[PDB]
């Protein structure tokens, strides 16, 4: 994550590590939305241009970690995928639209102090809480820097939501309604961004009204990392809710 810090421990219990089995290498992040399902960027699983394509088998999930490195033998759970749900209309050839993916873990997880699910937003939360100005919290283990570098522990940064127009002029890519962009304006004199390796991590917000943490987005794409006048894009988790259930109470 660029320009933020060491996540407190047990601070984002829904954070997940999408880890390639062998080479044992980190891919991206995910969230725990219930006790058999995780939520991630589809691009984290399939993105051909990078001749990237995993199966429920290349991958492993690590729930409960602090450290980017150490095997937390008694706090973290190494879990296995059962099936992958990659959004059908995921537009990886254009602007990565609906960069969403669901993974069903083989046998369920046991919540600890270190492991707890986040909440998908409802129509009213989504509604009262997603506005230019409000601030969300991004989390990851990826690139600390655009270029020149990895956290040794969980990095957290809190960035505010930015107006569609500003988002829309931030760049040349087609910004749609299933994405939002968060980050500091240039004249705002503050910084922070998610960067390569962050994708899949949750973009969460805490309710005033009820005090629970709601996942509002997933790290989708962005150009550079912490470039001025450039904002980062996140998947509209809500705008994609329907699918999210048609598949979960289905299969």
């Amino acid at each position: 994550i660029v320009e933020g810090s060491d996540a407190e421990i047990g601070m984002s219990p829904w954070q997940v590590m999408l880890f390639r089995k062998s080479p044992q290498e980190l891919l991206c992040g995910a969230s725990l939305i219930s006790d058999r399902w995780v939520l991630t960027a589809a691009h984290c699983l399939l993105y051909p241009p990078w001749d990237k394509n995993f199966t429920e088998n290349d991958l492993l999930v690590r729930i409960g970690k602090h450290s980017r490195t150490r095997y937390e033998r008694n706090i973290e759970k190494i879990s296995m995928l059962e099936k992958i749900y990659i959004h059908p209309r995921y537009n990886w050839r254009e602007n990565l639209d609906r960069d969403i993916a669901l993974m069903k873990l083989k046998k369920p997880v046991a919540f600890s102090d270190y492991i707890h699910p986040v909440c998908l937003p409802d129509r009213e939360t989504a509604a009262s809480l997603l506005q230019a100005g409000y601030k969300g919290r991004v989390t990851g283990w990826g690139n600390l820097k655009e270029t020149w570098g990895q956290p040794s522990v969980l990095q957290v940064v809190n960035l505010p939501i930015v107006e569609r127009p500003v988002c829309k002029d931030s760049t040349r890519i087609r910004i749609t309604d299933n994405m939002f962009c968060a980050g500091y304006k240039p004249d705002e004199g503050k910084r922070g961004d998610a960067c390569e390796g962050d994708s899949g991590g949750p973009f969460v917000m805490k309710s005033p009204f009820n005090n629970r943490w709601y996942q509002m987005g997933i790290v989708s794409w962005g150009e550079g990392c912490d470039r001025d006048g450039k904002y980062g894009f996140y998947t509209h988790v809500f705008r994609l809710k329907k699918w999210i259930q048609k598949v979960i109470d289905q299969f």
Binding site: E8, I9, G10, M11, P13, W14, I33, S34, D35, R36, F111, S112, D113, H116, P117, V118, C119, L129, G133, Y134, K135, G136, R137, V156, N158, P160, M205, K206, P208, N211, R212, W213, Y214
Partner: peptide, 30 residues
């Protein structure tokens, strides 16, 4: 699963504030 969702055992449930939680909460009221 989640119904008991998005409530941190080492925070909301101990009634502890994470060190930045608040930069966020004020961003709504402010």
């Amino acid at each position: 699963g989640e119904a008991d969702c998005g409530l941190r055992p080492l925070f909301e449930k101990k009634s502890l504030e994470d060190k930045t939680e608040r930069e966020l909460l004020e961003s709504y009221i402010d």
